[PDB]
Amino acid sequence: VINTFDGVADYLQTYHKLPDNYITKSEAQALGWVASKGNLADVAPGKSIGGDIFSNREGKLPGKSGRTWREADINYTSGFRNSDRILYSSDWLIYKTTDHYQTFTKIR
Amino acid sequence: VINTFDGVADYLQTYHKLPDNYITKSEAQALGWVASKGNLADVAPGKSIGGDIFSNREGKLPGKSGRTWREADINYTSGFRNSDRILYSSDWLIYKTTDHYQTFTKIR
């Protein structure tokens, strides 16, 4: 399983997709994920939430026409989701946040 | 320092090795390179990442039995790595990419 900042970052930039252990929120919900119950590991063992569009509401990440930002959970193993996320753009800029999308720093 | 597409391309085809300013990722990591910190120029001034095996996962580069593909960074001087790479085979076909290995074109 690849779920570290560095592992996922390098996987994205080379292969241009998330590793196989990622599923979107929508897919997780379809498998019976109930966020308020913290049960992702029961209904999808070994998987992490990732791949969803990050709207970048506060325009904190560098915006450009045609650039799309996505997120993925980092360091997740079980229970409620943590506060760690990788943010990656369609042109493979990679940022990280450890504080629930409050601050971002560049890692690739 | 030789770190341009044309300079490295011609060096490879004549001398059949990278110029001296190249080190592999493994060597860089051993010198204290931390990719997420963008610090290669601090721990190895004047050097660029290059020499590593490129697995050619998406079979985008022309494959053949016994042909090995390697990569090297191009145009790097400091900070995080850029998106520019030379791809060279063991029989000295030279390709370039400027978009993180998404597209390749022939230069020698």
Q: How far is residue B108's CA from residue B103's CA, in Å, rounded to a whole number?
A: 16
Q: Which positions in chain B touch A92 (Cβ < 8 Å)?
A: 83, 100
Torsion of CA A15, A21, A26, A32, to 10 degrees: 170
**Count of other CB atoms within 10 angstroms of residue A72:** 24
**Sheet of A94-97, strand order:** A22-23, A48-53, A69-73, A85-89, A94-97, A105-106
B58 belongs to the catalytic site: no
Structure tokens at B71: 């990569």
Whether A86 contacts A67, CB under 8 Å: no
Structure tokens at B88: 């060279």
Q: Which positions in chain A touch B80 (Cβ < 8 Å)?
A: 106, 108
**Technique used by the depositors:** X-ray
Structure tokens at A87: 């943010």
Q: Are strands B22-23 and B48-53 parallel, antiparallel or unpaired?
A: parallel
Tell me the domains of chain B and their CATH numbers. 1-108 (3.10.450.30)
Side chain identity, residue A89? S
Chains A and B form CB pairs within 8 A to the count of 29
**Count of other CB atoms within 10 angstroms of residue A90:** 12
Q: Do B36 and A10 touch (CB under 8 A)?
A: no
**Count of other CB atoms within 10 angstroms of residue A66:** 6
Give the helix ranges, DSSP H, for A1-108.
5-15, 25-30, 40-43
Q: What is the DSSP letter of A63?
A: P
Report long-range pairs for B61-64 (Cβ below 8 Å, ≥24 apart): B61/B87, B61/B89, B61/B95, B61/B104, B62/B89, B62/B93
Q: Do A9 and B100 touch (CB under 8 A)?
A: no
- Counting runs of H as helices and runs of E as strands, what totals does chain A give? 3, 6
Q: How far is residue A5's CA from residue A9's CA, in Å, rounded to a whole number?
A: 6
Structure tokens at A101: 């999308």
B100 belongs to the catalytic site: yes
